């Protein structure tokens, strides 16, 4: 399915960035000029029930999470452990609007019909686990394990689709426990 491919590609990118200690801010509408000129509001971001103003702050919170679980200065804890690792279990995607038109160049509207599976606004739900202090590939030797849920609203990246990320985050709700 076209929506599964799009979602799969985003999911793989997004959590790879986090696991490689790289910023995800470039995946949000905030940092796309085409959307910005068209007057799109900043991404709605909620982290464990708290509103976060910018994706850059979310990136900072992820750094802080690593620091919080960085026990490398310990002389007794087992060596070769990674502070934080995100594992995706599965995801679900639902097309909210198959004829999404915000900031769309007119050619893109004409070129892609609502049935072509390109101009989609998608609701993406991701389920997985967060491992703290675990070996790089272990799901058993963690010090702490969380379950997390991510809910994204994705919109088409016109810049890329007419030629980076083919879809951008317009909304993000994160919950981990």
Author numbering: 2 to 164, 170 to 183
What do the study authors state?
Mtr2 is a ∼15–20 kDa protein that also has an NTF2-like fold and forms a tight heterodimeric complex with the Mex67 NTF2L domain.
The UBA domains and Mtr2/NXT1 showed a high level of structural conservation (Cα r.m.s.d. < 0.8 Å), whereas the NTF2L domain showed the greatest variation (Cα r.m.s.d. = 1.9 Å).
